Design a protein around this motif. Structure first.
Motif, PDB file in Angstrom:
ATOM      1  N   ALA A  44      -8.452  -2.059  -8.969  1.00  0.00           N
ATOM      2  CA  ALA A  44      -8.327  -0.577  -9.066  1.00  0.00           C
ATOM      3  C   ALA A  44      -8.271  -0.087 -10.527  1.00  0.00           C
ATOM      4  N   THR A  78      -2.449  -1.215 -13.513  1.00  0.00           N
ATOM      5  CA  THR A  78      -2.459  -0.457 -12.247  1.00  0.00           C
ATOM      6  C   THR A  78      -1.029  -0.015 -11.967  1.00  0.00           C
ATOM      7  N   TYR A 236      -4.608  -1.711   0.545  1.00  0.00           N
ATOM      8  CA  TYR A 236      -4.681  -1.627  -0.932  1.00  0.00           C
ATOM      9  C   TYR A 236      -3.282  -1.872  -1.491  1.00  0.00           C
ATOM     10  N   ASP A 238      -1.966  -1.134  -4.291  1.00  0.00           N
ATOM     11  CA  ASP A 238      -1.358   0.094  -4.882  1.00  0.00           C
ATOM     12  C   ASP A 238      -0.675   0.942  -3.797  1.00  0.00           C
ATOM     13  N   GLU A 239      -1.304   1.147  -2.637  1.00  0.00           N
ATOM     14  CA  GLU A 239      -0.722   1.961  -1.534  1.00  0.00           C
ATOM     15  C   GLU A 239       0.575   1.280  -1.085  1.00  0.00           C
TER      16      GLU A 239
ATOM     17  N   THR B  75      -9.694   1.432  -4.117  1.00  0.00           N
ATOM     18  CA  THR B  75      -8.585   2.341  -3.781  1.00  0.00           C
ATOM     19  C   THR B  75      -8.972   3.274  -2.633  1.00  0.00           C
ATOM     20  N   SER B  79      -4.591   7.105  -2.895  1.00  0.00           N
ATOM     21  CA  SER B  79      -3.901   6.140  -3.796  1.00  0.00           C
ATOM     22  C   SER B  79      -4.537   6.072  -5.189  1.00  0.00           C
ATOM     23  N   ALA B  80      -5.669   6.740  -5.421  1.00  0.00           N
ATOM     24  CA  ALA B  80      -6.404   6.711  -6.708  1.00  0.00           C
ATOM     25  C   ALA B  80      -5.518   7.329  -7.790  1.00  0.00           C
TER      26      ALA B  80
END
Ligand SMILES: Nc1ncnc2c1ncn2[C@@H]1O[C@H](COP(=O)(O)OP(=O)(O)OC[C@H]2O[C@H](O)[C@H](O)[C@@H]2O)[C@@H](O)[C@H]1O
Ligand SMILES: Nc1ncnc2c1ncn2[C@@H]1O[C@H](COP(=O)(O)OP(=O)(O)OC[C@H]2O[C@H](O)[C@H](O)[C@@H]2O)[C@@H](O)[C@H]1O
Ligand SMILES: Nc1ccc(S(=O)(=O)N[C@H]2CC[C@H](O)CC2)cc1
Ligand SMILES: Nc1ccc(S(=O)(=O)N[C@H]2CC[C@H](O)CC2)cc1
Ligand SMILES: [Cl-]
Ligand SMILES: [Cl-]
Ligand SMILES: [Zn+2]
Ligand SMILES: [Zn+2]
Lengths: 277, 282
Positions: A44, A78, A236, A238-239, B75, B79-80
């Motif tokens: 990402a 990230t 993901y 990050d989520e 992403t 969530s970006a």
């Protein structure tokens, strides 16, 4: 180069929310948490992985090229990178094991004395004579533990070499030893964006399963060790990590740009723990 | 939808060598310092480093479609995170060096970065934005509005109206929102510098707006890895990653790239902040 371009799995939203609450419950209950990171935590920030749908090795196999959306030098840590900084600062991360050579954990300001870089670091050269490491602001121009052209400046003129293992090189004994110890003593091992296919790196999380430790795997594709997980989260990272930080009542800290921290600072205050059972 | 003209896809990337790249970014700083009215034009290449694929790059949505492959998202839209480029543009507006921002991007990151909506034209719409058909009132949502093509979303207006809410994502044949295009055109015509970042400039009229600056002697900078429709008309073409360009530019300008507080919506530009004094140029 192992199994490349396997299909991605997405937990549906209700299932995904449930699993992250359960991951929170496991972090709250755990004395010693170890995180294992692979190339999925940097995708990402525009750095391709190796075995994902558009991974380096996946694309090689299909006669295509991987695509970088950044340079190593311009890459930003990230959300996931910054969450791991904060989780170490508040005392919820014991140790960080990474297969990544992208140099982002170090540049994120994560303390090197709590980090094992098992496959090396593109920005790190090491003097063969005195083993003094240098964290540079640009990528060291070679790979395979080759001479970079620079000499040691320690009060030694030793030959500086890159830290990027070739396929047949054994893992740096210090990083692997500390990584193995942290994994054996952990009561929770969380994997983020690794398919766990590289020995021995991919096997260290299994060490936690010995003497009752819990194992969580967070990955879009299947991984070597899905069978051994107490919890698999298909989303993901990050989520997952942003929802986790929220459950834990922690903010994801700002990145001050490239900074190197050798030594973990004393732990900061953290929110009080929920009542669980 | 089927045979829509998707233009030139998968053109080879160009990389300015490092010495040439450092020289062109200094020259771009020289142009920003000299300019009264600077307008930035953004497209999908400013979001590729947050894991959202472009349209016509080597792994673009249309490029991959043409080769029978699928683009890859690292992403979700939700969530970006805004890129270094996104956040530099926030700062450049706050210190008064950006007059206006024209974007073809539907990814919602300019708005979520905190960039003020009254200095932003979203020519192709915004995935997080629905609009009431009856009163034209817009809603900036925390999740993607589930439809595209100016369709009913299923929600009604809540203004003291019950109007049908519709998405803002233009289909191929839909004309551009008159307000955004009107303001974008005026800002471009009156600009003495137009800087394009990560657009191939192939979509009319969006891709043509920077050329309007060239009228009455304005300067045009194009920042892009691939060639672009209007390379011929640029005073300066920089072939490099827009984050590398924009971080070196901010440094030259003496400005920090600010922290992202997470998704926030700013309707109206705040009063300008202090900025460093200008170098002697000539
Ligand atoms: N945003 C994302 N969120 C979650 N998972 C992701 C994301 N992006 C990618 N993935 C997953 O992330 C996973 C990445 O797995 P691999 O590509 O094997 O990288 P490694 O670190 O395990 O490779 C180890 C070594 O192998 C090499 O030879 C080098 O030596 C490496 O250091 C995939 O399953 C993706 O589904
Ligand atoms: N990190 C990067 N740095 C610099 N350039 C980049 C980077 N990543 C990509 N590029 C370049 O960025 C450029 C992106 O060009 P296009 O992919 O055509 O996107 P648009 O915004 O112009 O598409 C316009 C509309 O068309 C669609 O149908 C939609 O409706 C859009 O809104 C390429 O040349 C890349 O080389
Ligand atoms: N995510 C990533 C990181 C680095 C690269 S790479 O530099 O282009 N090649 C790798 C160097 C390290 C070695 O372990 C494996 C090959 C490509 C992708
Ligand atoms: N960088 C990007 C952004 C959005 C998408 S998308 O939502 O999948 N589809 C596009 C929506 C806008 C419309 O102009 C054309 C199709 C894909 C890639
Ligand atoms: Cl390719
Ligand atoms: Cl290896
Ligand atoms: Zn030495
Ligand atoms: Zn209404």
């Amino acid at each position: 180069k192992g199994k490349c371009g396997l299909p991605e799995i997405f937990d549906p939203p209700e299932e995904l929310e449930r699993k992250v609450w359960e991951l929170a419950r496991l972090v709250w209950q755990s004395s010693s948490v170890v995180f294992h990171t692979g190339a999925g935590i940097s995708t990402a920030s525009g750095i391709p992985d190796f075995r994902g749908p558009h991974g380096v090795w996946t694309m090689e196999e299909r006669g295509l090229a991987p695509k970088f959306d950044t340079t190593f030098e311009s890459a930003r840590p990230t959300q996931t990178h910054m969450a791991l900084v904060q989780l170490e600062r508040v005392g919820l991360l014991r140790f960080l094991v990474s297969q990544n050579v992208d140099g982002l954990h170090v540049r994120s300001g994560f303390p090197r004395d709590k980090l094992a870089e098992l496959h090396g670091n593109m920005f790190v050269e090491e003097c063969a004579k005195c083993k003094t490491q240098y964290v540079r602001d640009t990528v060291v121009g070679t790979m395979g533990l080759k001479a970079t052209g620079r000499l040691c400046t320690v009060a030694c003129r030793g030959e500086l070499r890159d830290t990027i293992l070739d396929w047949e090189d054994s893992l740096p004994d210090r990083d692997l030893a500390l990584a193995d110890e942290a994994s054996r003593n952990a009561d929770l091992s969380i994997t983020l964006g690794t398919s766990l296919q590289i020995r021995p790196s991919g096997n260290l999380p299994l060490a936690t399963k010995r003497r009752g430790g819990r194992l969580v795997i967070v990955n879009l594709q299947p991984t070597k060790h899905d069978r051994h997980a107490d919890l698999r989260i298909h989303g993901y990272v990050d989520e997952v990590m942003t929802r986790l930080m929220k459950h834990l009542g922690l903010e994801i800290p700002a990145w001050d740009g490239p900074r190197v921290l050798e030594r973990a600072l004393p732990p900061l205050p953290r929110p009080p723990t929920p009542k669980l059972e």
